[PDB]
Amino acid sequence: EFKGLDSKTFLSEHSMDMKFTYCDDRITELIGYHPEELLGRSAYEFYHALDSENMTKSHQNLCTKGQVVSGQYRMLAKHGGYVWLETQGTVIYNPPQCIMCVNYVLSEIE
Amino acid sequence: TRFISRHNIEGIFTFVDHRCVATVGYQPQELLGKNIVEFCHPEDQQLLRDSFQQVVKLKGQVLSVMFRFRSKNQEWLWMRTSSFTFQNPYSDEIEYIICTNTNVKNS
Ligand SMILES: CS(=O)(=O)c1sc(OC2CCCCC2)c2c1[C@H](O)C(F)(F)C2
């Protein structure tokens, strides 16, 4: 028996330089990380080498368009290996303050 | 000075980030299950309801609303809630609203 789409969905918040400023506790059941061990680190440090250029383009797009949907990408898991994710990113501005990420693990979990 | 909250289309808090204690005073357990309109100033309640109904129609765009939130210290704090609906494209489950709530000035 596997996890559903809501169970494989976690939220994350980042500053404009990609650094984690918040992460939902759900990432522990999915990727192994603890929100405190991610704080201050850049999201870029977690992408698979082969997905780096696409995420750079997605961030540049996100900055100009305000919102973006990444493609399928890989994120390094806590104890080796990589999970496949798909994220919807949204910039929160002051009518930029931060980036909100709705992250969904495509991979088969629990 | 901000926290993340997830809501159903009715405005019920279904997820609250722990940074809400600094921001409004309540622990996450005290907000879950409650509607966001219950903590809103009576003059801003209709506007906050109309914003939640419109953010559904805006196809994932951000809609910001300013309103007064009664803090646990019994004070009306000026909040700026930036919100957007999220629907997982792999499913047809009902969309839920995601908010960033920050204490801002009215000057
Ligand atoms: C909107 S996006 O381009 O899909 C996107 S995905 C992402 O981080 C991943 C979120 C899930 C855990 C691993 C890291 C980030 C972005 C933005 O560029 C960001 F700066 F907010 C950082």
Structure, explained:
Chain A has helices spanning 27-30, 35-38, 52-65, and strands spanning 9-14, 20-23, 67-69, 73-76, 82-92, 98-105. With 110 residues, chain A is of the alpha+beta class. Chain A has one domain. Chain B has one domain. Chain B contains 3 helices and 5 strands; from the N terminus they run ββαααβββ. Chain B has helices at residues 20-24, 28-31, 45-57, and strands at 2-7, 13-16, 63-70, 76-86, 96-103. Chain B has a 5-stranded antiparallel β-sheet with strand order 2-1-5-4-3. The two termini of chain B are 18 Å apart. The interface between A and B is medium-sized, with 20 and 20 residues. The complex binds ligand UYF. The site of the ligand CS(=O)(=O)c1sc(OC2CCCCC2)c2c1[C@H](O)C(F)(F)C2 has 18 residues of chain A, from strand 1, helix 3, strand 5 and strand 6. It is classed as transcription.
Radius of gyration of chain A: 13 Å
Written as H for each helix and E for each strand, in order along the chain, the element string of chain B is: EEHHHEEE
Question: Main β-sheet of chain B, in a few words?
Answer: 5 strands, antiparallel
Range of strand content of chain B: 25-35%
What is the approximate shape of chain A?
Answer: globular
Oligomer: heterodimer
Structural class of chain B: alpha+beta
Task: Show the helix and strand layout.
The complex is a heterodimer of chains A (110) and B (107).
Chain A: E1 9-14, E2 20-23, H1 27-30, H2 35-38, H3 52-65, E3 67-69, E4 73-76, E5 82-92, E6 98-105
Antiparallel strand pairs in A: 1-2, 1-6, 3-5, 4-5, 5-6
Chain B: E1 2-7, E2 13-16, H1 20-24, H2 28-31, H3 45-57, E3 63-70, E4 76-86, E5 96-103
Antiparallel strand pairs in B: 1-2, 1-5, 3-4, 4-5
Domain PAS (chain A): 5-66
Protein name (chain A): Endothelial PAS domain-containing protein 1
Subcellular location (chain A): Nucleus; Nucleus speckle
